[PDB]
Structures are given as C-alpha cells and as structure tokens.
C-alpha cells in the first residue's frame, strides 16, 4: 500500500529534451513528412532494427546503416526524396548531445532516496560505440551515483514495454507492485506496470508529474529548499597511499579525471571536510586529490615536532607529486592547508598550476619580529599559546572526541567557544557544554567519522603544526624578496572571527594578479557552512585560470 520504491525513465523524464522530440524538430527543419523519422525508427516493431539495438544484439554504429535504409524505404512509400545532406549519424549526434539532466526531476529523486526510498532507472538505451560516446558516458555516470539501480535495456536483453522486464525490475527492487511508483514519458510503457498494480505517472511536464508524485508518496518534492551538494560516502571512495619517505606515508582520496587538483584540509579536520567539494570538482572535469595532511587520519603521525614545520611539510607534498607522476597540481587549501599552499607557490612554483586558499591569508614574515611576539600582540590568537606546550592541549581535545568536534564544527550563529580567553581560563572547552547540541552543519554520522579518524593518531601530530613558530619564520624569511606570480585565489569568509577578511587586505602587494572571492554569513568551516558558494567560486576560478 505505502510506496517504497521509485523508478524513473531516462529519455524524457530524467534527461531532456527527449530524443524523439529532437527527432521531431529535425522533421520540421528539413521539411520531411511528419513522423517519417519515427516510422523508420520503429520499422519492424519487436523484430525490427531498433529493437535489436535496444536489446544489445547490435551496437549503435551497426544500427545507423539499418536506420538509413528504413528512412530510404519510408521515404519511398510516402513518395518523397531524402535531401542530399541526410545523415542519421549527424542527426542523432545532435540529439544525444543536446540532452541534459532534468534537475528538478533528479533533485526529487534524491529527496525520495533521502527519505528512505529505493530509486532506480529503467530506460531503453543502446550500446554506444560512437566516437562521441564519451558525452553520453559522462551523463550516465553522474546520474548513476544518485540511484540504487540502473536497469539498461541493452544490458539485460529486455525492452519496455515487454512484461518480462517489469518482472525483472520488481525482482531487482525486491518489492511488490503496489509498493513501487513508475514514471515514464510514454504511456505505452505504463500499461504493463499499471497491470501488475504499481502506481503510474505519465510525465508530460515535469512540475505536474512532481505534483502527482508528491501526492502518492506524501513527501514534499516541489518547492523544496535548495539541497546541499552531493556529499561523499567514505566506503565508496578510491583510497590511495603514497610513501613519501620512510615512516611517512600519506593517505588521500581520488575522484575524477583531468587537471590534478589537490585539496589540503586544516586543523582539526580531515579529507572528509571536502566531502561537498570533491564530487562537484570532479564533475567540473578535474581529478580531485583530497589529502589526509601529515599527522591526520590514515596518514603517518610521527611524534617529533620538527616533522611538522612548513619546510618539511612542503618538501613531502612535492615528493607526493613525484611518486604519483604529476609534474603540476592545483593546490587548494583551508586553514593550515591554505598557509601551506601559499608557501608551495613561493618555494615550488614549477609544481603548482594554481593556488587557492579559503580564509587563510598570505601574511609575509616579519624579519624584525619573532612570530611569538605577533601572536601575543593579538588576543584572538591566544589559543595558539595554549597549544604550544605539548601534552596540555592534547589531553583536553582527546578527552571527549564527540564533545570536541561538536563544539568546534559550528556555524557562525552557533558558537560556544571564546578564542580570546583560552590561556587565562586554562582550556579551550572550560566554559562550554559537556554534551553540546548538534550543529546545523554536521550530522551525527559525520561527527562520528571525525571521532574514528582521530582515535587513530590522536591530536599530537595536528597540534605540532602550531609548535614550529620559529622554524617556519626562519624558512619564510628566505622568500621575502619573491612574489607569487602564478594564478592565485583568496576566498574570505565574512563571519570568521579568527581569520578575518581584513587580515588579507595587503595581499595584493605580494600577489599582483590575485583574484578574490567572498562568502557572507560564513564561519570558519567554509566547506561545510556554505558548500554551494565554495563550489561555485572554485569551479569558476578553475575553469578560467587553472585549465587550458
Ligand atoms: C607572520 O605573522 C603570522 C603568522 C602566522 C599566524 C599569525 C601571524 O600574525 C600576522 C597564525 C595565524 C593563524 C590564524 C588562524 C589559524 N587557524 C586555526 O588555528 N584554525 C583552527 C581553529 C579555528 C577556529 C576555531 O574556533 C571556532 F571553531 F571557529 F570557533 C578553533 C580552531 C592559523 C594561523 C596560523 N598562524 C601561524 C602563522
Ligand atoms: Mg522516454
């Protein structure tokens, strides 16, 4: 009775415009008899060429000659002559290419799966061996990840509306007819489903079909707020391991193809902090490499403090590129990662295609002042003095991992921390709740991932990034006569009460062609506070500065 599974057609529902609709306009353009392309498309019926193509018996390249004869045969009966420029190859090439994803439909499908539905795609498709088959391959891959099953006609040897495929569909979904809703742009494909007892929605226009699907499922799909970008499931990611040197191996996650983009997280985060950026960046045509920085998660965490100074952390990232075969890579960082990528561009510009930083500005070294004096001359950086002593800051953060991350990963309007009274009060969480409320930015599952990551190597490694003030300062002073002249981007967050946008006001002195981005109502955790704006800024900057 109560629905539980949802099935979606591709051509006409999830993808628009349908191939039949582009074939109809072609009939109008070249002034053919109406429907002639569709009579040739459907010549022979269940024993014709198109059904042999839809069943995997022949490939698309094999079917085009058969479609050419059907058009010459159909044009002979209607007493007409096909133009001199008639090309079925070129006609379908434009149709397959013009087909885009119906985002209101896919977003509604995601909402159902989020609410606990089993989503699937049931489409009549073909084995595409065209030279331009990659265009259709990209489309399928980005739709496949959002559904539990993709049942293709040419893979199973069954086509709609043959009843055998619907019995195969119900077996795949492991559900009864009256528990499944099925959407298709063709009414013929619904009669066998409507006979087995499943709910049917004829999709003519998307917003009306969504109104019907709202009613039968009891879930609001239309006029739903803007959904978050696609997140990452760790157990479905490609996990990579590179040994940059003895006792030091770096763990990273990889997705997509194209120019290598290397993401560097901050303190106290993980590769998972790019969960909203990784698919979005890979979809834009990039090979994302989200790192576990030295001392974090599955990466090595040697205890020595000097192993985390900026000079060592940068030489190892260069090595990481070497052992992977990458001459360059776009470096996007946040918090400590952002500071590391600034010095990557300053010391190894030949290995940085482009550099970008979230929140963290490039503050050049002061040759006449130690960094400890400057940190003391700023009450917001007072927690960094508390971090200096080893073991002290570790005991507090490692005491209750759940409370630690729930008190940190909070929006700008949820803050329960006072970064300016840390050393005085003798702790970061002295005046914070023992069981803080779950922020709007992170679910309980996402918090429990960070907990499991930091159960590995603790907080010693991460905190050691703070404990190389004098070493990093001596190193940076060697680059005081340089200038960053590669593509650079500085993204500032309005409500970051520690890395304020005003700290970046002088950066153009050192980066003349610096580009900028600003995100409003955004706290420190830029990636998970405003992921849709982070994705927009980066994909726009990458497409114009990093790619060729
Ligand atoms: C050469 O002059 C400097 C040089 C340098 C530094 C300062 C300098 O003076 C100009 C400081 C600056 C700095 C600032 C922030 C961070 N980020 C960070 O610690 N993030 C963790 C975190 C953030 C917010 C939190 O609170 C809440 F969660 F939002 F609530 C809790 C934790 C890093 C650095 C790097 N430093 C050394 C270099
Ligand atoms: Mg269709």
Tokens in use for 477?
Answer: 């002073």
Within this chain, do residues 184 and 260 fall inside the same structural domain, yes or no? no
Instruction: List Cα–Cα distances, 452 to 184, 234, 434, 455, in angstroms.
Output: 44, 12, 19, 5
| 141, 283 contact by CB (below 8 A) | no
Asked whether residue 368 is domain-assigned, the answer is: yes
Breaks (C–N over 2.5 Å) after residues, the chain: none
Mutate to test the pocket of ligand 1, among 346, 363, 428, 462 (most ligand atoms within 8 A of CB): 363
- Residue 288 CA to chain centroid, in angstroms? 9
| C-alpha to C-alpha distance for 353 and 502, rounded to whole angstroms | 27
Alpha-carbon distance of 79 to 73, in angstroms, equals 10
- Looking at all shown ligands, the one closest to residue 186's CA atom is 2
Q: Do 365 and 383 belong to one domain?
A: yes
Instruction: Quickly tell me which residue has 């400057």 as its tokens.
Output: 374
Counting ligands in written order, the one closest to the CA of 385 is 1
Query: Does residue 485 fall inside a structural domain?
Result: yes
Q: Is residue 265 among the annotated active site residues?
A: no
What is the 3 state secondary structure string of 8-44?
ECCECCCEECCHHHHHHHHHHHCCCCCCHHHHHHCCC
- The dihedral region occupied by 298, where left means phi > 0, alpha psi between -120 and 50, and beta the remainder, is alpha
Ligand 1 centroid to Cα of residue 381, in Å, is 6
Give the C-alpha separation, 294 to 431, whole Å: 31
Q: Is residue 49 part of a domain?
A: yes
Distance CA 356, CA 388 (A): 28
d(CA 545, CA 317): 22
Q: What is the DSSP string of 200-241?
A: EEE-SSHHHHHHHHHHHH----TTPPPPPPPP--GGGSEEEE
* Ligand 1 surroundings by CB, under 6 angstroms: 266-267, 335-336, 339, 363, 365-366, 371, 374-375, 381, 408, 415, 417, 419, 498-499, 524
The burial of 496, by beta-carbon neighbours within 10 Å (0-12 exposed, 13-18 middle, 19 or more buried), is given as buried
List the catalytic residue out of 276, 286, 296, 466: 466
Is residue 335 part of the annotated active site? The answer reads yes
Does the residue 456 lie in any domain?
yes
Which atom of ligand 1 is the closest one to the Cα of 267?
A: 21
For residues 54 and 176, membership in a common domain is answered with no
* Spatial contact of 297 and 252, defined as CB atoms under 8 Å apart: no
| CA gap 129, 501 in Å, rounded | 52
| Ligand 2 centre distance from Cα of residue 124 (Å) | 8
Task: Indicate if 167 and 248 belong to the same structural domain.
Answer: no
3-state secondary structure of 304: coil
Compute the distance from residue 508 Cα to the ligand 1 centre, in Å: 20
Nearest CA to ligand 1 atom 36: 466
Catalytic residue among 335, 386, 450, 496: 335
- DSSP states of 432-443: S-SSPPPPSS--
166 and 267 assigned to the same domain: no
**Which ligand ends up closest to the CA of 441?**
1
How many domains does the structure of the chain reveal?
A: 3
- Where is 319: in which H helix or E strand? helix 310-324
296 is catalytic: no
- Characterize the bridge pairing of strands 118-123 and 149-152: parallel
Cα distance between residue 240 and residue 292, in whole Å:
10
CB burial string 422-444: b at 16+ within 10 A, e below:
beeeebbbeebeeebeebebbee
Q: Is 178 contained in some domain? A: yes
Residues 6+ apart with CB under 8 A from 33: 27, 75, 78, 80
Q: Determine how β-strand 287-291 pairs with β-strand 15-16.
A: unpaired
Atom of ligand 1 nearest to the CA of 525: 29
Would you call 117 exposed, middle or buried from its count of C-beta atoms within 10 A (0-12, 13-18, 19+)? buried
Give the contacts of 420 (CB within 8 A, at least 6 positions apart): 379, 380, 382
Out of 360, 368, 384, mutate this one to test ligand 1's pocket (max ligand atoms within 8 Å of CB): namely 384
What is the resolution of the experimental data for this entry, in Å? Answer: 3.1
Judgement on whether residues 123 and 24 belong to the same structural domain of the protein: no
Same domain, 283 and 426: yes
At which residue do the structure tokens 């060697």 appear? 478
In this structure, the answer to whether residues 8 and 25 fall within a common structural domain is: no
Residues 6+ apart with CB under 8 A from 155: 56
Query: Could you say which of 73, 97, 121 is where a domain stops?
Result: 97
Residue 116: CB atoms within 10 A of its CB come to 8
- HEC profile for 445-484? HHHHHHHHHHHHHCCHHHHHHHHCHHHHHHHHHHHCCCCC
User: Nearest to residue 232, comparing CAs of 292, 296, 278?
Assistant: 278
Residue for token digits 């539980």?
4
Contacts of residue 457, defined as CB under 8 A and 6 or more positions apart, other chains included, come to 295, 296, 297, 301
- Owning domain of residue 144: 2-17+98-218
Of 97, 113, 129, the one marking the end of a domain is 97
CB 185 within 8 A of CB 204: yes
What is the length of the chain?
548
Same domain, 287 and 187: no
Of 54, 45, 46, residue with least CA distance to 19:
54
Yes or no: say if 509 and 222 are a contact pair by the CB < 8 Å rule: no
Residues 504-534 as b/e (b if ≥16 CB within 10 A, e otherwise) read beebeebbeebbebebeebbbbbbbbbbebb
Give CA–CA dist 95/116, Å, rounded. 34
Q: Is the dihedral of CA 99, 105, 110, 112 positive or negative?
A: negative
Beta carbons within 10 angstroms of residue 284's beta carbon: 18
DSSP state for residue 399 in the 8-state scheme: T
DSSP 521: T
Q: Are strands 15-16 and 199-202 parallel, antiparallel or unpaired?
A: unpaired
């Amino acid at each position: 009775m109560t629905l539980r599974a949802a099935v979606f057609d591709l051509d006409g529902v999830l993808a628009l415009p349908a191939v039949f609709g582009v074939l109809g306009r072609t009939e109008e353009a070249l002034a053919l008899p109406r429907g002639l392309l569709n009579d040739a498309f459907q010549k022979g019926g269940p024993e014709g060429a198109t059904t042999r193509l839809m069943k995997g018996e022949i490939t698309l390249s094999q079917w085009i000659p058969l479609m050419e004869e059907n058009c010459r045969k159909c044009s002979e009966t209607a007493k007409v002559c096909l133009p001199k420029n008639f090309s079925i190859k070129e006609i379908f090439d434009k149709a397959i290419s013009a087909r885009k994803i119906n985002r209101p439909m896919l977003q509604a499908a995601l909402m159902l799966r989020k609410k606990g539905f089993t989503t699937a795609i049931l489409t009549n498709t073909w084995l595409d061996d065209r030279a331009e088959r990659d265009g259709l391959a990209q489309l399928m891959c980005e739709l496949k990840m959002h559904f539990d099953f993709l049942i293709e006609s040419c893979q199973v040897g069954m086509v709609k509306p043959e009843p055998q495929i619907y019995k195969f569909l119900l077996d795949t979904l492991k559900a009864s007819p009256s528990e499944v809703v099925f959407l298709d742009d063709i009414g013929a494909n619904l009669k066998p489903a409507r006979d087995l007892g499943m709910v049917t929605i004829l999709v003519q226009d998307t917003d009306t079909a969504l109104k019907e699907l709202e009613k039968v499922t009891g879930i609001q799909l239309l006029n739903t707020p803007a959904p978050l970008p696609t997140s990452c499931n760790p157990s479905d990611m490609s996990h990579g391991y590179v040994t940059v040197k003895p006792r030091v191996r770096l763990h990273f996650v990889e997705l997509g193809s194209g120019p290598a983009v290397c993401l560097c997280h901050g303190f106290p985060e993980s590769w998972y902090s790019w969960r909203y950026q990784i698919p979005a960046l890979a979809q834009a045509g990039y090979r994302v490499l989200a790192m576990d920085m030295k001392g974090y998660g599955e990466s090595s965490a040697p205890p020595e403090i000097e192993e985390y100074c900026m000079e060592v952390l940068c030489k190892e990232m260069v090595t990481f590129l070497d052992k992977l075969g990458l001459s360059q890579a776009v470096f996007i960082g946040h918090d400590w990662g952002g500071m590391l990528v600034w010095y990557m561009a300053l010391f190894y510009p030949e290995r940085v295609r482009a550099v970008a930083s979230l929140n963290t500005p490039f503050i050049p070294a002061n040759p006449n002042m130690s960094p400890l004096e400057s940190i003391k001359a700023n009450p917001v950086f007072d927690y960094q003095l508390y971090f200096q002593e080893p073991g002290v800051a570790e005991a507090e953060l490692e005491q209750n991992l759940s409370r630690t991350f729930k008190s940190l990963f909070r929006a700008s309007d949820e803050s329960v921390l006072s970064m300016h009274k840390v050393c005085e009060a003798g702790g970061l969480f002295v005046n914070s709740p023992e069981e803080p409320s779950l922020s709007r930015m992170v679910t309980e599952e996402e918090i429990q991932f960070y907990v499991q990551q930091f159960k590995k190597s603790g907080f010693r490694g991460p905190l050691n990034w703070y404990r190389n003030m004098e070493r990093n300062w001596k190193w940076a002073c060697k680059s005081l006569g340089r200038k960053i002249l590669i593509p650079a981007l500085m993204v500032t967050a309005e409500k970051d009460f520690v890395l304020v946008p005003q700290m970046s006001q002088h950066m153009e002195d050192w980066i003349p062609h610096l580009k900028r981005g600003h995100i409003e109502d955004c706290g420190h955790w830029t990636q998970m506070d405003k992921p849709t704006e982070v994705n927009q800024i980066l994909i726009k900057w990458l497409d114009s500065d990093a790619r060729n």
